[PDB]
Subunit: 281 residues, 3 copies
């Protein structure tokens, strides 16, 4: 898909918090297309995003971002009078920025990386009940020259669920051998977990690729993660291992048993998966 | 900026273990002056420090540090007769070393970082009564050319508290927009936590800040941590996000909800906090 | 000294058996099983065929982290690659050197501190097979890697170190100045914080910085949860001297209840000063 360009476009989008089946809550880019996870927000460093947000719930909701620049007005908390009342609208405003030398000669970390947004005022003032119900979603902020993927898949460990799904309902994601798949992995709630993928590995750093033969970042297939931790990577599907149904799961042993498990379906060029007996789950 | 010198002085300090109000145990720089956490001890790589310790409790205590060089005699553990009787005194010596190449020709990591000290002898032989009641403190060992801060603030997640404080008592931490703020973050006791800061982000490396455009240290705003973990960072306060009461909190949902929160009170240059009730 | 560049096809026989005391483990010969299992060491490019035998009365299997295996070597009941009671199976592991793709991007190497474990006993994620000790280490070395005087594996399995009864180590001995490798794996149900007295290491691939432009953190305390694996190499007693150098999980209760051990660093004349158990 090429590579990211340099940023600096004032983007704007519409966001709504809606009720979902089963008492669940979610964000969507249009009324009635709310999902869990929320819609993937993607940005290039420099970009500015106005988020026009409406609350269709009977309770106040908010919209709070990790890792992006925001004045306190866009804090998204009761503490800075920045929530959205029932039936209310409010425009939030996020900025990103590039790395660069400061006047004291110290490097200013840019805004790039794998981030998230969630609610901060439902249930409690730290968003506990809203986060549990599914008011969360991913934010990617690229830097110029970042390799771009063929696909992007978000995997939130929210307590003992994957993306609030029922135990052992995945989700599963598909690809084809060689694809540049990207994974965003976020964690929410009470518990710590350990994210693990069969047959694939990545570098523990911003992009999940090594920069080169002098990138000392370690190569893992298992990452521990806690509430609100976010990381991402990109892998080449089946690189060095082939097609097949490739397990991902939480490696905390009671958590894969209770069903924090899903499948990375990496397919041959003809769309088949060898040995994928769908009844092996 | 104005950085940290090279090291290699011999330094000396007096530290006491005391009871404070209501079952509290703590280290101080002089008597009566005990604090939780204990006093910040700061060095530059290669400095030797001679801690002249005195136990003022009616039970044994020790002084044990992370990451610095000490010889086995200054473990601060009962298991090798390093603890201190009630009323006793003992000098613990910690050393620091610069980075450098070795005998076999590999690079030997400097003793620089964000470290800590704690008791190892109260309640149990791993300091479980002593860690739980406040007998811990921060340690920073600066390299050469380390950027120096305007202020330093220690945040310790000691099981379910920040600095053995009551629930929902901060601490709160003040700065002006533009101040170079260093944060010493230590976890202790029983729970993993995940450290969070509103509006501010830092590098997951030694300094908390990147070396330049080839430093691949991840930039994060949320860090999982477990007992005896120590990291730290420098951020430019309200840089790119402005003045206001910026929350920091354990992002474990019940933990924040149960009071593991405090406010980073950041000022416009006139000493006021937009949107906050001072 | 230094590790070579890989490329051999290496064969080995592997056995799952019951141990005394009702546990389970892997060995290289029959009656020689161990918890953890034996250390498997590879160079980047090395292929290893694992001639594997289930001597247990239930399906066991072998599943590896890090390495390149085809879905046929997956080790899961899910992909029908577990081994029935009494059966044999060859699991094949490959490794790859790093290198730049036609992509232009940089492909990471198989090198690392890895581990194998059972995926089919107890449950279909090997929870009962890991619990009773069916686990063990792997070190894939990159061309030129430093090689040590010793390697020791410390597995945090729930609240046991190497499935050992509480407060019984294991202790490992060394002489001042030795180069000592530690493989640290965690398994099971709990998070942990692995800590060593008197010693520190780099939080990167090898546990040692490349030099003064390696920005890696230096630590002596690392939080790890089920299936985490890492390693390092420390110079024994470096700058700190001989002694009984304690290592433990740093969750207070976990240390209190026997997740402790010792790193016994001898003076060259074999004395460990002031040590008396
Ligand atoms: Cu928050
Ligand atoms: Cu989990
Ligand atoms: Cu948050
Ligand atoms: Cu200790
Ligand atoms: Cu917490
Ligand atoms: Cu300690
Ligand atoms: Cu698995
Ligand atoms: Cu533990
Ligand atoms: Cu596994
Ligand atoms: O696994």
């Amino acid at each position: 898909a090429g590579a990211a360009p340099a940023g600096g476009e004032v983007r704007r989008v519409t966001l709504y918090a809606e009720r979902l089946a089963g008492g669940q809550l979610g964000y969507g880019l249009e009324k009635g297309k709310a999902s869990i996870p929320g819609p993937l927000i993607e940005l290039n460093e420099g970009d500015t995003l106005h988020v026009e947000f409406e609350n269709t719930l009977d309770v106040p909701v908010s919209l709070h971002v990790h890792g992006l620049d925001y004045e306190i007005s866009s804090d998204g908390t009761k503490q800075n009078k920045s929530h959205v009342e029932p039936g209310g609208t409010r425009t939030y405003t996020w900025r990103t920025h590039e790395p660069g030398r400061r006047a004291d000669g110290t490097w200013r970390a840019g805004s790039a990386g794998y981030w998230h947004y969630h609610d901060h005022v439902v249930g409690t003032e730290h968003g506990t009940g809203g986060i549990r119900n599914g008011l969360y979603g991913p934010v990617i902020v690229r830097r110029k020259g970042d390799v771009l993927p063929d696909a992007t898949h978000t995997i939130v460990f929210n307590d003992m669920t994957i993306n609030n799904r029922p135990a052992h309902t995945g989700p599963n994601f598909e690809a084809t051998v060689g694809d540049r798949v990207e994974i965003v992995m976020i964690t929410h709630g009470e518990y710590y977990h350990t994210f693990h993928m069969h047959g694939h590995r990545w570098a523990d750093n911003r992009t999940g690729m090594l920069t080169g033969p002098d990138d000392p970042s370690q190569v893992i297939d298992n990452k521990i993660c806690g509430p609100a931790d976010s990381f991402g990577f990109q892998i080449i599907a089946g690189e060095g291992v082939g097609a097949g149904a490739w397990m991902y799961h939480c490696h905390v042993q009671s958590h894969s048993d209770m069903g924090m498990v899903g499948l990375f379906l990496v397919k041959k060029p003809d769309g088949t998966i060898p040995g994928y007996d769908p009844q092996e789950h």
